[PDB]
Design a protein around this ligand. Structure first.
Ligand SMILES: CC(=O)Nc1ccc(C(=O)O)cc1
Length: 115
């Protein structure tokens, strides 16, 4: 509360660390469904069903331009990519499996890096 501060986690390296994690995700061989925005004009159903599209190149643009206030807002966008993937793809499809694989991959990097 007022004039009573909790000790503050050192966040000075967060930007560099999130950038490293994003790089590792960009270079994963199962990252191909997630590198670019889904084409809303060429994929039936996507625009109406998926209220907030997100993809790695969009996350990268936002990271590079000061659009994440903190590391938690970054993790929310990454998770949104995989949440969207589950909403739209069968668990047993190449893309659906790619999504599950990348989420597992991300969450371990997240834990190892910040916890
Ligand atoms: C991220 C994501 O779901 N992408 C896509 C892209 C294309 C299709 C399709 O054409 O079936 C399905 C899903």
């Amino acid at each position: 509360s007022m004039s009573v501060k909790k000790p503050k986690r050192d966040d000075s390296k967060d930007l560099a660390l999130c950038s490293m994690i994003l790089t590792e995700m960009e270079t994963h061989e199962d990252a191909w469904p997630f590198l670019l925005p889904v084409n809303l004009k060429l994929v039936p159903g996507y625009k109406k069903v998926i209220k907030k599209p997100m993809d790695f190149s969009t996350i990268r643009e936002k990271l590079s331009s000061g659009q994440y206030p903190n590391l938690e807002t970054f993790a929310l966008d990454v998770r949104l990519v995989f949440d969207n993937c589950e909403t739209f793809n069968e668990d047993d499809s190449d893309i659906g499996r790619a999504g599950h694989n990348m989420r597992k991959y991300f969450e371990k990097k997240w834990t190892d890096t910040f916890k």
